[PDB]
Amino acid sequence: VSKDLDYISTANHDQPPRHLGSRFSAEGEFLPEPGNTVVCHLVEGSQTESAIVSTRQRFLDMPEASQLAFTPVSSLHMTVFQGVIESRRALPYWPQTLPLDTPIDAVTDYYRDRLSTFPTLPAFNMRVTGLRPVGMVMKGATAEDDSIVALWRDTFADFFGYRHPDHDTYEFHITLSYIVSWFEPECLPRWQAMLDEELEKLRVAAPVIQMRPPAFCEFKDMNHFKELVVFD
Template structure:
């Protein structure tokens, strides 16, 4: 699916955004350094050494060579993942992003222990395949490759919502993605046409080289910032990751 210039302008262009990007100052600073923002999540990491990983490494290099690339805080390749279900995160301690029966001042580490305990007997759900939809300045939009895959992903999300005890407002419309960068500042409108061309080429290259993205099994993870997501339990295995 080609990226439309109007979409880039609306979501990434300076002309539409007098305010700073929303994660600036909490998730990363003006230099692009990631800041402490602990939490937990359920993700599917890229398979290390796979054709998918190499395609995204090459895409990252193209992003970094673009005009205004200095306005992006790039995440490390080893952190690349598709979020299957959002856990809790420091700085967002209110309903419906937090289980109603748990005190909102509970430490993040204790929340991770609580969720891990709740997940001990969860066997997981059906396998699914994922494909790229489009490339954006911040990464890739992805979805289940078939209707059955999309149904399976929704089934996983519904199960986690029941176990964790909350549903985000976008629970049913959540856009699956692989984050490659965050905006430090908005892109100048003048560079958007060249970004549009590059993004369409990147999406087509990934689609050709990795028609089904090579992802690891879903894993419950903890994190301190956006540099690394530590797998605590990989679903389909009996024991936690040691």
């Protein structure tokens, strides 16, 4: 069992997942939690998407899938820069220029306007480097890609008018699920063996993760991200 997978063990926690009751119910159904964000969706029908969907099925095959809240296939995305969200009306997760009680839709309008002058930045390619029950860890396909996506994020920080504490150490990922209840330790070696096998299968099938260009989106909940401004 890797250090990374052991995070989700019952032994590592004294309270349920913090998202429980806000982002999703105990039965793994997603709850209203509106916000906005910049993300790259997968390309529907692409070999990348099919590969990821196969990985996602290996996860669903596990009995502990019952303790995970899987998002829809059509929602799959890599976040490039988090926007605001109803559940986190606080600095430094909010622009200081806006009242903390501003309706989410008004923040979306402020940003749609501000993002009308977003500069053309170079394209980047990403690759999958790890797997865990919640999804895929990613980095730049090459070291130069890391530098390019960091430039996108630094530029977004200027437009959005805040930076999170992890801004410079941000872990790129694609979420396949949320943990609803922590895993008993006895099933972990099996998950590790499957994650190892599926990671290598995924890396071969999708050696770069094909995606759409970054887009500023709004959402009601984790099920769907409506593209408002595409940075293509």
